[PDB]
Amino acid sequence: GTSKLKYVLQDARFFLIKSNNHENVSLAKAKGVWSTLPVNEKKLNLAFRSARSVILIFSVRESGKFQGFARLSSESHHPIHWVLPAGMSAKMLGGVFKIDWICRRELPFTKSAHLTNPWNEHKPVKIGRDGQEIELECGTQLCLLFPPDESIDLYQVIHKM
Ligand SMILES: CN(CC1=NC(=O)NC(=O)C1)Cc1ccsc1
């Protein structure tokens, strides 16, 4: 069913989150954590206090796909063995957000071509800088396009709201 998913997404806020590589998404899926640069850390902390659910929709750069989506379960807090771009130190990251995965399945950009994001000039939702907010209706429809992830039980996530 899709009803518990719709409940989690009710009045949620949504953000497009990019990853430099697949390894960091794999680590995030295994450990339930994410980290960003300080600019997006501030945005996500403000949103976490502001809304019943904050949803991160992940896309590895140049992959042509989204790799899943998760709900923030905490504000950022201050070692995870991230695989960082050349020249980047771990000291350049903000804190660590805890996340609960809602779907670990992928969705190719070709399947979201009918959805536009009002907060990025109504461009297709796949288009946006890291941290771009996705308006509620667009974000809800995007999440509902993903294949169902029958390995996840949203009962536990609902209790955290
Ligand atoms: C786990 N982090 C991967 C990310 N990659 C990215 O492009 N944006 C992010 O919020 C997070 C570490 C990091 C942060 C800026 S580069 C590499």
Coordinates of C-alpha atoms and ligand atoms in Angstrom, one line a residue:
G1 CA 0.0 0.0 0.0
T2 CA 0.9 3.7 -0.3
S3 CA -1.2 5.1 2.6
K4 CA 1.5 5.2 5.3
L5 CA 3.8 6.8 2.8
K6 CA 1.3 9.5 2.1
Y7 CA 0.9 10.1 5.8
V8 CA 4.6 10.5 6.3
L9 CA 4.7 13.0 3.3
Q10 CA 1.7 15.1 4.5
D11 CA 2.8 18.7 4.9
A12 CA 6.5 17.6 4.5
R13 CA 9.3 19.7 3.0
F14 CA 11.5 18.2 0.3
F15 CA 15.1 18.8 -0.8
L16 CA 17.1 17.6 -3.8
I17 CA 20.4 16.2 -2.3
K18 CA 23.3 15.4 -4.6
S19 CA 26.1 13.0 -3.9
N20 CA 29.6 13.1 -5.4
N21 CA 29.7 9.3 -5.8
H22 CA 27.7 6.1 -5.2
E23 CA 29.9 5.1 -2.2
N24 CA 28.6 7.8 0.0
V25 CA 25.0 6.9 -0.8
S26 CA 25.8 3.3 0.0
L27 CA 27.3 4.4 3.3
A28 CA 24.2 6.6 4.1
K29 CA 21.9 3.7 3.3
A30 CA 23.8 1.3 5.6
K31 CA 24.4 3.7 8.6
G32 CA 21.4 6.1 8.4
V33 CA 23.5 9.3 8.3
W34 CA 24.3 12.2 5.9
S35 CA 26.5 15.2 5.9
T36 CA 26.6 18.4 3.8
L37 CA 28.5 21.6 3.4
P38 CA 27.7 24.3 6.0
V39 CA 25.4 26.3 3.6
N40 CA 22.9 23.4 3.2
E41 CA 23.4 22.3 6.8
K42 CA 21.9 25.6 7.9
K43 CA 19.0 25.3 5.5
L44 CA 18.2 21.7 6.6
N45 CA 18.4 22.6 10.3
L46 CA 15.9 25.4 9.8
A47 CA 13.6 23.1 7.9
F48 CA 13.8 20.3 10.5
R49 CA 12.5 22.6 13.1
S50 CA 9.8 24.0 10.7
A51 CA 8.0 20.9 9.5
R52 CA 6.5 17.6 10.5
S53 CA 8.8 15.7 8.0
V54 CA 11.9 16.8 6.0
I55 CA 12.5 14.5 3.0
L56 CA 15.9 14.3 1.3
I57 CA 15.7 12.9 -2.3
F58 CA 19.2 11.7 -3.4
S59 CA 20.8 11.8 -6.8
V60 CA 24.4 10.8 -7.6
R61 CA 25.9 13.3 -9.9
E62 CA 25.9 12.2 -13.6
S63 CA 24.0 9.0 -12.8
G64 CA 20.8 10.0 -14.5
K65 CA 18.8 8.7 -11.6
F66 CA 17.5 9.2 -8.1
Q67 CA 18.8 6.6 -5.7
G68 CA 16.1 6.8 -3.0
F69 CA 14.7 9.1 -0.3
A70 CA 14.9 9.5 3.4
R71 CA 13.4 11.5 6.3
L72 CA 15.6 13.6 8.7
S73 CA 15.4 12.3 12.2
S74 CA 17.7 14.9 13.8
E75 CA 19.3 18.2 13.3
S76 CA 23.0 18.1 12.5
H77 CA 25.4 17.2 15.3
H78 CA 29.2 17.0 15.6
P79 CA 34.0 9.8 12.3
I80 CA 32.2 8.6 9.2
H81 CA 34.5 7.3 6.5
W82 CA 33.1 9.3 3.7
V83 CA 34.8 9.2 0.3
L84 CA 35.4 12.9 -0.3
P85 CA 36.4 14.8 -3.5
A86 CA 40.1 15.5 -4.0
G87 CA 41.4 18.4 -2.0
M88 CA 38.4 18.4 0.5
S89 CA 39.1 17.8 4.2
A90 CA 36.6 16.3 6.6
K91 CA 36.8 19.6 8.5
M92 CA 35.0 21.3 5.7
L93 CA 31.8 19.4 6.4
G94 CA 29.0 20.5 8.6
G95 CA 27.7 18.1 11.2
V96 CA 26.0 14.7 10.7
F97 CA 22.2 14.3 10.2
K98 CA 20.5 11.1 11.2
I99 CA 18.1 9.8 8.6
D100 CA 15.5 7.1 8.2
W101 CA 15.2 5.6 4.8
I102 CA 11.8 5.5 3.2
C103 CA 12.8 4.0 -0.1
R104 CA 16.1 2.6 -1.2
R105 CA 15.0 1.8 -4.8
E106 CA 16.1 3.9 -7.7
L107 CA 14.1 6.0 -10.2
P108 CA 15.5 7.1 -13.6
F109 CA 15.1 10.8 -14.5
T110 CA 13.2 9.7 -17.6
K111 CA 10.3 8.7 -15.4
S112 CA 10.0 12.1 -13.7
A113 CA 10.0 14.2 -16.9
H114 CA 6.3 15.2 -16.3
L115 CA 7.1 16.9 -12.9
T116 CA 8.2 20.5 -12.6
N117 CA 9.5 22.3 -9.6
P118 CA 8.0 25.8 -9.0
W119 CA 10.9 26.7 -6.7
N120 CA 13.3 26.3 -9.7
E121 CA 11.4 28.2 -12.4
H122 CA 9.2 25.2 -13.1
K123 CA 12.2 23.3 -14.6
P124 CA 12.0 19.5 -14.6
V125 CA 12.4 18.3 -11.0
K126 CA 15.7 16.5 -11.8
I127 CA 17.3 19.9 -12.4
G128 CA 18.6 21.8 -9.4
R129 CA 21.6 22.6 -7.4
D130 CA 22.5 20.6 -4.4
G131 CA 20.0 21.6 -1.6
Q132 CA 17.3 22.9 -4.0
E133 CA 13.9 22.8 -2.2
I134 CA 11.1 21.0 -4.1
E135 CA 7.6 22.4 -3.6
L136 CA 5.2 20.2 -1.7
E137 CA 3.0 18.9 -4.6
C138 CA 5.9 18.2 -6.9
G139 CA 7.9 16.5 -4.1
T140 CA 4.9 14.3 -3.1
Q141 CA 4.3 13.2 -6.7
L142 CA 8.0 12.5 -7.2
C143 CA 8.2 10.3 -4.1
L144 CA 5.1 8.4 -5.2
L145 CA 6.8 7.6 -8.5
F146 CA 9.5 5.5 -6.9
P147 CA 8.9 1.7 -6.9
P148 CA 7.5 0.5 -3.5
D149 CA 10.2 -0.6 -1.1
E150 CA 8.6 -3.6 0.7
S151 CA 11.6 -4.1 2.9
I152 CA 10.8 -0.9 4.8
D153 CA 8.1 -0.6 7.6
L154 CA 6.9 3.0 8.0
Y155 CA 5.3 2.3 11.4
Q156 CA 8.5 3.2 13.2
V157 CA 9.0 6.4 11.2
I158 CA 5.4 7.5 11.9
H159 CA 6.0 7.3 15.7
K160 CA 8.9 9.9 15.3
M161 CA 6.7 12.6 13.9
Ligands
LIG1 C1 28.6 12.7 2.6 N1 28.8 13.9 1.8 C2 28.5 13.6 0.4 C3 27.8 14.8 -0.2 N2 28.0 15.2 -1.4 C4 27.4 16.3 -1.9 O1 27.6 16.7 -3.2 N3 26.5 17.0 -1.2 C5 26.3 16.6 0.1 O2 25.4 17.3 0.8 C6 26.9 15.5 0.6 C7 30.2 14.5 2.0 C8 30.4 15.7 1.0 C9 29.8 17.0 1.2 C10 30.1 17.9 0.2 S1 31.1 17.1 -0.9 C11 31.1 15.5 -0.2

